Structure formats: C-alpha cells, structure tokens
C-alpha cells in the first residue's frame, strides 16, 4: 500500500502559474527525500526538483531555476511544485517520486499528472500541396490548426491504396499534419472543431 | 544528457545490451540507476547502485558501470521487456540528476525493414505567407525508432525542427514525419537541403536544391 498520487494538472496559458500536489500513503513521508520528474509528449524523462526529508536541501534543474518552487508538508503527507512563468516547453506529464536514502534510487513513482501550457484557440488549418520518377508521391500539408483532430482522405475516400496520413506535430502552439499518396488527385481535409472542410487538387 | 542508443533489439531468447555514456561529473563520480517505462505508464525502478535489482525485477536484467559509462544487459529477451529504458546519475557539477535520452527495446516479431524517405520542398502558396516548411516523410520501418537530422548547405540545423512520434501503419510497420520550418527569406538565402534518417545501423539521406 506504498503509493504516490499527483493532482492539480490541467490547462494553463503561457506566462501563467499552477501548483501541483502529490499525496503520499502507506509509508513515513517525513523519512524520505522527494522528487519531481517530467516528460514532454513523446520525449525523454527530465528531472525537475528534489527536496530533503526536512526541506534543508533543495535542488532545481537549470531549465526551471527561478520559476519553480518545491515544498512539502510532512504533517499533511504532501509534496508540492509551484510553477510560475509557465512556457510551452513546460508542457509535460509530471511525476512525483520517492528517493531511497542509501541508494538515491527513485523506487516509488506516482501515476503522473498532465500540465498543458497553451493559449491556443480554435484555428482552421491552411492546406498546402506537397509535390517533388519510378512512382509519383504527392501530398497535402495541413498546417496550423487547433484543436485536434483533422480527418484526411483522397478523392473522397476512393483513393485508399498507397496513402499515408501521418500523426500531427505541435509546431509553435498549433498542430501540423501531412498526408501523402503514391500513385486528378484531391486531398479532402476536415477540421470539425472550426466547422471547416477543404478539398485541394494536387498537381506535379 | 547521458547518451543512449535510440534503439536496441533482438529476437525472443537473445541477449541485448543498452549502453549509457556520461562524463566525469556524473557517471564518473556516482552510481547509475536504470528505469523501465512501459508505453503510456509511469517509469519504474529497474536497477539501482549500478547492478542491484529491487524485488520483482527478474535476474535476466543486469547492470554494470566502468569509467564514465554504464550498461544494461537483458538476457533471454521476452516480449514483455519491450519498453523504453533510461539511465540516470547525479551530476556533482550541476547539483542535478541527469537522465539518458532513453532507448526503446524492441523484441523482433517480424524482420527489420529500412525506412522509405521522401523529401518535399515548400509550396509557392506557403512561401507567399513568408514561411517555408520542408516535409520529410518516413514510412515502412521496423523497429519503430528513427533519429532525424537536417542540413542546410551542408551545415547541421540546430533549430526549427519537429519530428512526430512513430505510429503504426496499416501493414504493422511504422511511419513518422519530420518538419524543417524556415522563414521565406532564409529559404531563398540557401540552396541545398537534406533530411537524414537513421534507423538501427542504416542511415538514408534525401536531398533537394531550391
């Protein structure tokens, strides 16, 4: 029954602030150093901050120095992370982790809480052609929309063989996706959130 | 960060190693810990103090450390070992933990397949907006891990790049795309553009001229 549970995640605008909490159960919380570690979507783990048993020793990653504050309430079995001047690059799942005294290993981790830093508002996509000889590959670049998703087809779903519709990337604060067809060729893009549909004829 | 290979792979029952290369201030001065992260789940402790296993970790996982490098070996590869593995060490210079970039371990369930790469130039329509996006599409690769590098007039690009996480294709191989964003003036200032995709021990480079 040794568990950690983070809470307080959600959507916040750039420049804004958020306070995360981690509740400890089934162990003497005051006997352990505690850490925050984060992971941006599809990226690696990035250590954020750590606090000693009695808050005497506090460390921060250079990436968060002067913006984040770690604290703890030993009576309330709770760890906190106060995040100020939030930037798009702070978007991540934040985990709290317990550190073993003898070994410094993070032996127990919470489930994580997602923090999304974005001022993006509903935006329709701009659609541009992708064009360059054994086989011709044409495509459509569906640029700068929000939120997900967009649906992409070719020739109103009649052209399905040789098509690759790729996952989206966050490029600034907006999404960008591409679709290609290896073959009079039309890409059909639908973005329901902005009530927009685009049909674009692609020529080499 | 600590340097790890993006991908490691083997067939079930095989022995696979994952390297972790650091510097004197971290691995050179402190113990290395390893974390296993199954897709969409929180990391868990795999190895601590270089070579110790917590309860629940099977003996097929072992760790070692020498100089400024550490290594994780997985013997008798099992399908459930498919995950991302990260090494970590305290850095005495930064007074901070440093993690490796992670290695995805694939347990081969089909033969390897090299990526098919296509490079597209920006459209005149986009250029009218004073922006230029080059698109590097990547399909039909297995294991599902690629590293993308871009060059402009032979010089490596350090900014304005985004690469998707790889996703499964209709045929069960993987696909991904990479983007290079420039201003229209920057596009007009240069001539040669290339997208380089590294997959296992295979690198493919596609180029174009403005």
Numbering used by the authors:
A (entry chain H): 1 to 132, 145 to 189, 198 to 203, 212 to 218, 231 to 244
B (entry chain L): 3 to 110, 115 to 212, 215 to 218
What text comes from the article?
Mcl-1 (myeloid cell leukaemia 1) is a member of the Bcl-2 (B-cell lymphoma 2) family of pro-survival proteins that regulate programmed cell death via apoptosis. Mcl-1 is an anti-apoptotic member of the Bcl-2 family which binds to pro-apoptotic proteins containing the BH3 domain, a short α-helical stretch of around 16 residues. Binding of Mcl-1 to the pro-apoptotic proteins prevents apoptosis. Here, we report the characterization of an antibody fragment produced in vitro against Mcl-1 which was formatted as an scFv and a Fab.
However, when the CHO-Fab was screened in co-crystallization trials with peptide 1, crystals appeared that had not been obtained without the peptide. The Fab VH/VL chains were structurally very similar to those in the CHO-scFv, giving a Cα r.m.s.d. of 0.41 Å. However, no density was observed for the peptide. The CHO-Fab had been screened for crystallization many times over the course of the project and only produced crystals on this occasion. It was therefore assumed that the peptide had some influence on the crystallization, perhaps promoting nucleation.
